[PDB]
Amino acid sequence: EKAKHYHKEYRQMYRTEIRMARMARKAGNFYVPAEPKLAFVIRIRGING
Amino acid sequence: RVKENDQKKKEAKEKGTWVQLKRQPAPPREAHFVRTNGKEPELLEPIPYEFMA
Amino acid sequence: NELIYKRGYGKINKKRIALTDNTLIARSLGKYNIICMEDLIHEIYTVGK
Amino acid sequence: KGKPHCSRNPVLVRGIGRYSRSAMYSRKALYKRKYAALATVTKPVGGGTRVVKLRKMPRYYPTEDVPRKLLSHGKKPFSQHVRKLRASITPGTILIILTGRHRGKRVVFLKQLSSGLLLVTGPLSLNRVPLRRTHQKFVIATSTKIDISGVKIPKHLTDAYFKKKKLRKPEKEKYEITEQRKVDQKAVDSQILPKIKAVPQLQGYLRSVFALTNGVYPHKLVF
Amino acid sequence: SGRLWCKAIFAGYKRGLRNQREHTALLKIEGVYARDETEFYLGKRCAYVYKAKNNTVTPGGKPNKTRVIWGKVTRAHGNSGMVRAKFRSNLPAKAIGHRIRVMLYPSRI
Amino acid sequence: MKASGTLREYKVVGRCLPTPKCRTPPLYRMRIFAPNHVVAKSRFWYFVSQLKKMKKSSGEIVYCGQVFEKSPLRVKNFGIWLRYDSRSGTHNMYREYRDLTTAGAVTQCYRDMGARHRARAHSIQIMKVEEIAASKCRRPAVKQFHDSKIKFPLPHRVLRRQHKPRFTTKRPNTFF
Amino acid sequence: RGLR
Amino acid sequence: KNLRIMLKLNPYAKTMRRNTILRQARNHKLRVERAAAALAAKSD
RNA sequence: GCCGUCGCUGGCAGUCGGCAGAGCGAGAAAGAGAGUGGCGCGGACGCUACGCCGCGACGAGUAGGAGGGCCGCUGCGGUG
RNA sequence: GGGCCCGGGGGGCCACGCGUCCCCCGCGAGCGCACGGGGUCGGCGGCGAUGUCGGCUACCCACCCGACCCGUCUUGAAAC
RNA sequence: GUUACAGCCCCGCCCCGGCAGCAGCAGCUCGCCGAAUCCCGGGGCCGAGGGAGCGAGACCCGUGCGCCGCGCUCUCCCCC
Ligand SMILES: [Mg+2]
Ligand SMILES: [Mg+2]
Ligand SMILES: [Mg+2]
Ligand SMILES: [Mg+2]
Ligand SMILES: [Mg+2]
Ligand SMILES: [Mg+2]
Ligand SMILES: [Mg+2]
Ligand SMILES: [Mg+2]
């Protein structure tokens, strides 16, 4: 059930940000989404120097 | 901060609630709407180079 | 999802143990209500407490 | 006790059923299907009787034994493997044998045996290939097919029928075409052969032997 | 009777410019001059057939001087239709520029 | 900025972060031609920083979005006003191109400025892109295609399939 | 108990 | 890649996958019938 | 995949057998507890504990340091 | 949109005993298939006593890639 | 010179005039994606480990397909 609930939770977060931008565009304004809270970092350089 | 914490820790205790005591680094700014107010954003262009010698 | 399912390894007793069972997550993060790979993905993705 | 029922859950894909747990619960009517909580053989003798041990302790033990193996799953024997067949090999297709003494000949596919080897006939009169087994990995299936749907293949042409029979050598022992095999060859040939002759030039095609020549590359051509 | 293998040339070994990996051979197949045509040949048996002084046995035959190293096409190589092949023993370097049979089995068609 | 692939046109809108003094800062908009939006946002901050006391730290992007070509099936003449740094000075240029998309015309400019002046995209600032009527175009290369009865052959067609066959019995023909 |  | 491994870790994945297979096979049926009536209507 | 090093200062004395009863890897403290009243005679290997077993990480090297050699040489006490 | 997707008048649910009080309105038995704690076949073929089978390494030869002669002082040695 | 014996651009009213279709098998006119994603197939390399027990139980001494995960059938009765 936790997985079932998260699925619903993720769906609302996805839909909600879509819906928020539409209502801004409807009224001629801009919806600015929240700065991301999460990053993934990959080291691309070796360890010499 | 020590004083305000101990006072909050004592004021919220008698009220049976929970308050933030630890500081935090500035979080990323939350979502918000920006009203255009019926105006079009000013178009900007780079200016021509002019040799101001 | 795919980062944690294909390449998800736990640091259990300072060892690199693949997350091949839910009991691995529950024994370490259970005290935070994290008892399955799905709870782990939700605590990561949403940046929980 | 009750007669077994066909699985009420049709297979959607391998490992997933069509119906959820509660859908199956209703289908199986589990709401009303509720439930709640010799080693010695005696014999006579001329003492009178002897209690006999069916299986006796070993008379010898080796100095060392190997342990037991850990338990696995899915490692079935060969006889229980599922058999696959390229979709391009349908009964009546003209195949090209790639190996053996018959390499290059064009044969007629009949059916896939239970062991998964293909049963083919030359026919014997066209190219001298009898009813013979062959691996599908070593045949090129062409697009030439004859309709042998009305051909009756004897039910006894099975895998054990074609399995090689050991011959002892103490000089040499030779293979002898059994009279049954000759009778069998005619039964199938006498049906397929007239069907070959309905297609013009097909018999000549099955007489000829496939070969590569100058400028002919397999990746370029259609079989 | 006729030929039942495709003509391939043993171009060389897998290598950089100063390192050579002799467990893999690069085969140039007649008529295969793009990477998109090599698909038919992948996994096909490959036979380096040669002759020696001493006689050797023959499956289903009597001893002769012919010998073979078997292998198979493992993958394409480059954009112009070369294939990588692996053999039960590394091909001798005397075989560079010579014929490598490519059989028509294991057949996927 | 690298002019990788075909550029796209982006509409980037940004502003200063609101403060107690000015709770509603004005919205600035720029036309940015870039490979991807991430590059588009970066260039925006590079230009507004030149025109205003503003940088990424003290401002935000309100909207980044591609501007699709409005008449992709029409042939147009585009005039491009640009400044660029040569090895020994900066110069304003005006150039004309024929294309179907405005972004396609800007991409032709980056290849062209690189070809004729060895100009790397980091030293080119597209100031303005205007679709121009046939009667206002100045460059003879563009104007010679303003002929409703334009006709020309394709002389000396060079064989481009030169390795299929690699060896042939007959010499190629170049007249078609 | 109920399941039984 | 291994179905039964994902279920030992996330049993609800079986429900999600079954729904996708049904939903995708249902939507495919709609288009095929929708596309046909376009063909038959055009022939009218 | 295999070799070694390091760490877990990890596990094994429980081979507790017919004077018998096979377990303690398991998300979440502490007893497979003790009671008082209302036919066959059978069951692999192990444990040089300086031994055996498991899991995870790692492995460049001059000057230099340290460990282990069931590496090698000559003689002495025991032993074979 | 959110409220176990509030409350009233064809398609999927990890809903399915009951006495009740009432918020609200502690053991069923079997059997079986497996994407399930690291590979098996309960699958086959050819050859074999005088010229043939196996023999890593090892002897000779060949070819392809690699490859400058050591010790030493030295910032630096293949060093004229 | 201004639709005529071709056409092109814009505009006002025509339900954003109406219909397919819809980031299109007009297999490329231009994108970013997958809790809004699943199915099937092909080639290549590899097989490390080796006492996991199950159930009967002190009324039994069996059997070596056994853990966890996922199904199926029976212990109900009808129908095709
Ligand atoms: Mg460096
Ligand atoms: Mg070292
Ligand atoms: Mg060299
Ligand atoms: Mg040299
Ligand atoms: Mg010296
Ligand atoms: Mg010096
Ligand atoms: Mg030196
Ligand atoms: Mg010198």
- One-character DSSP codes across F102-137: HHHHHHHHHHHHHHHH---GGGEEEEEEEEE-TTT-
Backbone phi, psi, residue B38, to 5°: 60, 25
HSE (CB half, 13 Å, CA atoms) of H36? Answer: 5
Contact H37, H31 (CB under 8 A): no
Nearest bound ligand to the CA of residue A45: 1
List of residues 6+ apart from F152 with CB closer than 8 A: none
Q: Round to whole Å and give the CA distance between E47 and E100.
A: 6
Q: Round to whole Å and give the CA distance between F129 and B45.
A: 10
Strands E20-29 and E5-15: antiparallel
Helices (H), ranges, chain D: 21-27, 124-127, 159-162, 179-198, 202-207
Distance from CA of D36 to the nearest CA of G (A): 5
Cα pseudo-dihedral C14, C19, C24, C26, rounded to 10: 110
Indicate left, alpha or beta for A28 from its phi (over 0: left) and psi (-120 to 50: alpha): left
Q: Give resolution, Å, one decimal.
A: 2.9
D13 touches strand J (CB under 7 A): yes
Cα pseudo-dihedral A36, A40, A44, A49, rounded to 10: 90
**Tokens 């999600």 identify what position?**
H16
Indicate left, alpha or beta for H34 from its phi (over 0: left) and psi (-120 to 50: alpha): alpha
- B43 to F30: CB separation less than 8 angstroms, yes or no: yes
Q: How many residues does chain D have?
A: 223
Q: Round to whole Å and give the CA distance between C11 and C40.
A: 14
Token digits of residue E29 = 């197949």
Residue nearest K29, CA–C1′ metric: F72
Report long-range pairs for D195-199 (Cβ below 8 Å, ≥24 apart). Answer: D195/D146, D195/D147, D195/D148, D195/D151, D196/D108, D196/D123, D196/D126, D196/D146, D198/D146, D199/D146
E93 touches strand J (CB under 7 A): yes
CB atoms within 10 A of CB D162: 15
Beta bridge partners of B44: none
Token digits of residue D22 = 């509660």
Token digits of residue D16 = 């997933």
Indicate left, alpha or beta for D213 from its phi (over 0: left) and psi (-120 to 50: alpha): beta
- H4 to D15: CB separation less than 8 angstroms, yes or no: yes
How far is CA F54 from each of CA F16, F44, F48, rounded to the nearest angstrom?
7, 11, 6
End-to-end alpha carbon distance in chain B: 56
Q: Round to whole Å and give the CA distance between D72 and B45.
A: 71
Indicate the helix (H) or strand (E) that contains A23: helix A2-26
Q: Which residues of D31-63 are buried (b: 16+ CB within 10 A; e: fewer)?
A: eeeeeeeeeeeeeeeeeeeeeeeeeeeeeeeee
Q: Round to whole Å and give the CA distance between D202 and D208.
A: 10
Indicate the helix (H) or strand (E) that contains F31: strand F28-34
Q: Any idea which nucleotide's C1' is nearest the CA of H4?
A: J35
Backbone phi, psi, residue D64, to 5°: -145, 145
Instruction: List the chains bordering chain A where 3 or more Cβ pairs fall under 8 Å.
Output: B, C, F, H
Q: Would the CA dihedral through D55, D57, D61, D65 be positive or negative?
A: positive
Q: Round to whole Å and give the CA distance between C48 and A6.
A: 13
Token digits of residue F25 = 């800062």
D60 CA to K53 C1' in angstroms comes to 27
- B40 to F29: CB separation less than 8 angstroms, yes or no: yes
Q: Any idea which nucleotide's C1' is nearest the CA of D25?
A: J16
List of E strands, F41-117:
59-66, 76-86, 89-99
Backbone phi, psi, residue F89, to 5°: 155, 170
Under DSSP, the state recorded for D58 is P
List of residues 6+ apart from E66 with CB closer than 8 A: E49, E50, E51, E56, E58
List of residues 6+ apart from F144 with CB closer than 8 A: none
Cα A49 to ligand 2 centroid, rounded to whole Å: 21
Q: Which residues 19-78 of chain E have a CB under 7 Å from nucleic chain J?
A: 19-20, 22, 54-57, 59-60, 63
Cα E18 to ligand 4 centroid, rounded to whole Å: 14
CB atoms within 10 A of CB D104: 19
Q: Does A11 touch chain H (CB under 8 A)?
A: no
Best C22, C40, C42 member to test H by mutation, with max H CBs in 10 Å, is C22
HSE (CB half, 13 Å, CA atoms) of D25? Answer: 5
E88 touches strand K (CB under 7 A): no
Peptide bond into D67 cis (omega under 30): no
Q: Does B47 touch chain A (CB under 8 A)?
A: no
A8 CA to J6 C1' in angstroms comes to 18
Token digits of residue D59 = 């008379």
Distance from CA of F45 to the nearest CA of A (A): 17
CB atoms within 10 A of CB B22: 5
Helices C37-45 & C22-29 angle (0-180, nearest 10): 60
The 3-state secondary structure of chain E reads CCECEEEEEEEEEEECCCCEEEEEEEEEECCCCCCCCHHHHCCCEEEEEEEEEEEEEECCEEEEEEEEEEEEEEEEECCCCEEEEEECCCCCHHHCCCEEEEECCCCCC
What is the amino acid identity at position E22?
A: E
CB atoms within 10 A of CB D8: 13
List of residues 6+ apart from F96 with CB closer than 8 A: F77, F78, F79, F80, F132, F137, F138, F139, F141, F142
Please give the residue of chain A at the shortest CA–CA distance from B32: A32
Under DSSP, the state recorded for B30 is P
Cα D143 to ligand 7 centroid, rounded to whole Å: 73
Q: Round to whole Å and give the CA distance between D191 and D108.
A: 12
Indicate left, alpha or beta for F133 from its phi (over 0: left) and psi (-120 to 50: alpha): beta
Residue nearest J48, CA–C1′ metric: E57
Backbone phi, psi, residue E56, to 5°: -145, 160
Q: Does E33 touch chain F (CB under 8 A)?
A: yes
Peptide bond into D200 cis (omega under 30): no
Backbone phi, psi, residue E68, to 5°: -145, 145
Q: Does F57 touch chain B (CB under 8 A)?
A: no
How far is CA F90 from each of CA E9, F2, F32, rounded to the nearest angstrom?
59, 20, 21
What is the amino acid identity at position D49?
A: T
How far is CA D98 from each of CA D101, D104, D117, F74, rounded to the nearest angstrom?
9, 6, 15, 59
After which residues does chain D show a gap where C to N exceeds 2.5 Å?
Answer: 37, 46, 170
Nearest to D188 by CA among D132, D134, D93, D121: D121
D61 CA to I79 C1' in angstroms comes to 36
Nearest to C10 by CA among C20, C21, C19, C1: C19
**Tokens 């998309």 identify what position?**
F101
E54 CA to J59 C1' in angstroms comes to 19
Contact E9, E99 (CB under 8 A): yes
Our measurement of the distance from residue C1's CA atom to the centroid of its chain's CA atoms, rounded to an integer in Å, reads 11
Helices H12-43 & A2-26 angle (0-180, nearest 10): 50
Question: Under DSSP, is residue D193 helix (H, G, I), strand (E, B) or coil?
Answer: helix
Q: Round to whole Å and give the CA distance between F58 and F16.
A: 6
Give the strand order in the sheet containing F76-86: F89-99, F76-86, F124-132
Please give the residue of chain H at the shortest CA–CA distance from A6: H12
- C36 to A6: CB separation less than 8 angstroms, yes or no: no
Please give the residue of chain A at the shortest CA–CA distance from H13: A3
Indicate the helix (H) or strand (E) that contains F50: helix F37-51
Instruction: Count Cβ atoms within 10 A of the Cβ of residue D135 and give its class: 0-12 exposed, 13-18 middle, 19 or more buried.
Output: middle
Contact C33, C39 (CB under 8 A): yes
List of residues 6+ apart from F134 with CB closer than 8 A: F77, F143, F146
Instruction: Count Cβ atoms within 10 A of the Cβ of residue D17 and give its class: 0-12 exposed, 13-18 middle, 19 or more buried.
Output: middle
DSSP letter string, H1-44: --HHHHHHH-THHHHHHHHHHHHHHHHHHHHHHHHHHHHHHHH-
- A7 to H11: CB separation less than 8 angstroms, yes or no: no
Please give the residue of chain D at the shortest CA–CA distance from H2: D15
Token digits of residue E2 = 């006729």
B40 CA to K13 C1' in angstroms comes to 28
Contact D113, D119 (CB under 8 A): yes
CB atoms within 10 A of CB D223: 15
Contact B36, A31 (CB under 8 A): no
**Tokens 């994902």 identify what position?**
H6
Instruction: Count Cβ atoms within 10 A of the Cβ of residue D161 and give its class: 0-12 exposed, 13-18 middle, 19 or more buried.
Output: middle
Contact C28, C36 (CB under 8 A): no
Q: Round to whole Å and give the CA distance between D219 and E75.
A: 15
